[PDB]
Amino acid sequence: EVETFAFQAEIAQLMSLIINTFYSNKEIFLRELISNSSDALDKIRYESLTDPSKLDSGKELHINLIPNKQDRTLTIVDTGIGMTKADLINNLGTIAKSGTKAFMEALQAGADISMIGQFGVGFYSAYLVAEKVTVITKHNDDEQYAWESSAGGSFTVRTDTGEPMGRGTKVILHLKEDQTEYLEERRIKEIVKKHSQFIGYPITLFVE
Ligand SMILES: COc1ccc(OC)c(Cc2nc3nc(F)nc(N)c3[nH]2)c1
C-alpha cells in the first residue's frame, strides 16, 4: 500500500521556485546529490567505529553514477547510512523547513540557486533536471522504502518490493525531456571533475 503525504508548505514553495525560475546552470544538481551521499557515507563510517556490526549489511563505502537512456534516468547510488521511514515522512521535512526559509530569503540580497546546499536543502535541486524523483533507501534499523515525488505538493512512501539493496540510498532522476545531456558519459565526467573532484569515496561512472 502507498501512503501519500503533503510537503510542508515552505518545501512545496521551494520546489515550485526551483521548477519555475529561469536558471541555466542546472548542472549543480549532481554535486548536491553526491555531497548528500558523501555525508551519508561519513555517517555510517563514523557509526561503525564503535559498532563494526553496522557494516554487516555491506563493507564497501562508495558512490555509483548510472545513466540509462532507455529509461531516461540518472541514478545516484550510495552505500551510506540510509534513511528510516521516520526520516522520509517527518524528519527531513522538519529540518528542511528552516533551510528552505533561509534559502528563499538569501535569494533576495541576490544569492542564486547554486547556493542551495549551504542551506542543507540541496536535494531539491534534483528538480532542475528531473520531472520525477524516486528514492530507494535502506537503513540498518528499518525496512527498504521507496519515496517518490513529481512535486505538485505531494510525495508518496511505500515499502519497496524491488531488489534488496543491503544498505544505502539510490536517487533515481527521471529526467525532463530537454535534460538528456546528463545521460551522456562525457557530460557527467565533466561535471564530476568540476564540482565533486575531492569526494573521499570512490565515484564510479557507469557507461551504457
Ligand atoms: C527523499 O529524500 C530526501 C529528501 C530531502 C533531503 O534533504 C532535505 C534529502 C537529503 C539526503 N538525505 C540523505 N540521507 C541519506 F542516508 N543518504 C542520502 N543520500 C541522503 N540525501 C533526501
Swiss-Prot record:
Positions where N6-acetyllysine occurs in the chain:
43, 69
* UniProt-annotated stretches for the region Interaction with NR3C1: 1-208
Paired cysteines (S-S): none
- What happens to this protein after translation, modification-wise? ISGylated.
Q: Where does ATP bind?
A: 36, 78, 97, 123
Superkingdom field = Eukaryota
Name where it's found.
Answer: Nucleus; Cytoplasm; Melanosome; Cell membrane
Its biological purpose is as follows: Molecular chaperone that promotes the maturation, structural maintenance and proper regulation of specific target proteins involved for instance in cell cycle control and signal transduction. Undergoes a functional cycle that is linked to its ATPase activity which is essential for its chaperone activity. This cycle probably induces conformational changes in the client proteins, thereby causing their activation. Interacts dynamically with various co-chaperones that modulate its substrate recognition, ATPase cycle and chaperone function. (Microbial infection) Seems to interfere with N.meningitidis NadA-mediated invasion of human cells. Decreasing HSP90 levels increases adhesion and entry of E.coli expressing NadA into human Chang cells; increasing its levels leads to decreased adhesion and invasion.
Q: What is known of its domains?
A: The TPR repeat-binding motif mediates interaction with TPR repeat-containing proteins like the co-chaperone STUB1.
The family note in this entry says: Belongs to the heat shock protein 90 family.
| Assembly behavior | Homodimer. Identified in NR3C1/GCR steroid receptor-chaperone complexes formed at least by NR3C1, HSP90AA1 and a variety of proteins containing TPR repeats such as FKBP4, FKBP5, PPID, PPP5C or STIP1. Forms a complex containing HSP90AA1, TSC1 and TSC2; TSC1 is required to recruit TCS2 to the complex. The closed form interacts (via the middle domain and TPR repeat-binding motif) with co-chaperone TSC1 (via C-terminus). Interacts with TOM34. Interacts with TERT; the interaction, together with PTGES3, is required for correct assembly and stabilization of the TERT holoenzyme complex. (Microbial infection) Interacts with herpes simplex virus 1 protein US11; this interaction inhibits TBK1-induced interferon production.
- Name this polypeptide is given: Heat shock protein HSP 90-alpha
UniProt source species: Homo sapiens (Human)
User: From the entire protein, which fragment is shown?
Assistant: 16 to 223 of 732
